[PDB]
Amino acid sequence: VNSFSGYLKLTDNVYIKNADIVEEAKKVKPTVVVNAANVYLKHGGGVAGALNKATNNAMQVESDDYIATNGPLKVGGSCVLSGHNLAKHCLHVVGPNVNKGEDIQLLKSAYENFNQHEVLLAPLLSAGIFGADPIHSLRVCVDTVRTNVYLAVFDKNLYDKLVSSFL
Numbered sequence: 001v002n003s004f005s006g007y008l009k010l011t012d013n014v015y016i017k018n019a020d021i022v023e024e025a026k027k028v029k030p031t032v033v034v035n036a037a038n039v040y041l042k043h044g045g046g047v048a049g050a051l052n053k054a055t056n057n058a059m060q061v062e063s064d065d066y067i068a069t070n071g072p073l074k075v076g077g078s079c080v081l082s083g084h085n086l087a088k089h090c091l092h093v094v095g096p097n098v099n100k101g102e103d104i105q106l107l108k109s110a111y112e113n114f115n116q117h118e119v120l121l122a123p124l125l126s127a128g129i130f131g132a133d134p135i136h137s138l139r140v141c142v143d144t145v146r147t148n149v150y151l152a153v154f155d156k157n158l159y160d161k162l163v164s165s166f167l
């Protein structure tokens with residue numbers, strides 16, 4: 001039993017809700033919140049900009065130190081950093097950004113990072129401003145993640161389409 005509320009169950013391990021991931025994280029304080037990161041951990045917009053804003057820029061400060069030490073992530077890769085006031089940990093995961101020409105096949109590799117954590121609150125990787133088809137992202141999520149994932153979909157209209165089209 002966990003404290004996630006109001007989710008529709010899609011499969012044995014995947015759940016979905018129309019929600020602002022920032023507000024969800026502040027309520028649940030999950031062990032792991034997933035950020036839709038880029039390789040530079042520059043949290044400018046989308047989920048990343050919103051999460052970072054909610055941390056009063058502490059996420060960005062921590063991220064800049066991480067990059068200065070370690071260099072950029074790989075597309076499809078991840079790192080674990082602090083969750084600040086939102087969660088115990090933040091798993092920064094880089095899905096391919098179609099608006100940069102990156103290979104959509106890397107989306108499966110990106111979701112594989114979720115399997116290192118028993119339970120996660122997460123967005124749909126590569127959706128939104130990353131330019132991929134969210135229906136496809138949900139399909140890859142369900143077919144790749146084996147741990148318990150609670151997906152927050154910000155856009156209500158998109159949420160309804162994802163549910164109604166789910167196979």
Ligand SMILES: OC[C@H](CC1CCCC1)Nc1ncnc2[nH]ccc12
Nearest residue numbers: 020021046047050123127128154155
């Ligand atoms: O990339 C996933 C998603 C893409 C868009 C959301 C609506 C239409 C497409 N972004 C978000 N998902 C959940 N909570 C969020 N809070 C701020 C941003 C955000």
